[PDB]
């Protein structure tokens, strides 16, 4: 169980903070990562962290934009987004980084041409 909160209409240039709730597991031990699905687009991975919080991660789109944060004691993740632009609107999802995939070494390529 996880449970995102915080999203609304932003002007551009605009702040937002985005919570996920967790429950049912053992969220101190867990990397979790939020991933946005732009409207039409597919599954797009946007931060992150470490379940200490000691390691964060960005993609490039976001880098220096948005911060990646963590509450052991509320077990809740939170992603601060500022300097909002127009390819920031999307649905936001927070996700246990590895708990379904791999991502990151797994795939195969299959190429129809």
């Known amino acids: 169980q996880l449970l995102e909160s915080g999203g609304g209409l932003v002007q551009p240039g605009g702040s937002l903070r985005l919570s996920c709730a967790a429950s049912?597991?053992?969220?101190?031990?867990?990397?979790m990562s939020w991933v946005r699905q732009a409207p039409g687009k597919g599954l797009e991975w946007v931060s992150a962290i470490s379940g200490s919080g000691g390691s964060t991660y960005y993609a490039d789109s976001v880098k220096g934009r948005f911060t990646i944060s963590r509450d052991n004691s509320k077990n809740t993740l939170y992603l601060q987004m500022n300097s909002l632009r127009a390819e920031d609107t999307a649905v936001y999802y927070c996700?246990?980084?590895?708990?379904?995939?791999?991502?990151w070494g797994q795939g195969t390529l299959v190429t129809v041409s």
């Open positions: 996700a246990k980084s590895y708990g379904a995939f791999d991502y």
């Open positions: 049912g597991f053992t969220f101190s031990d867990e990397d």
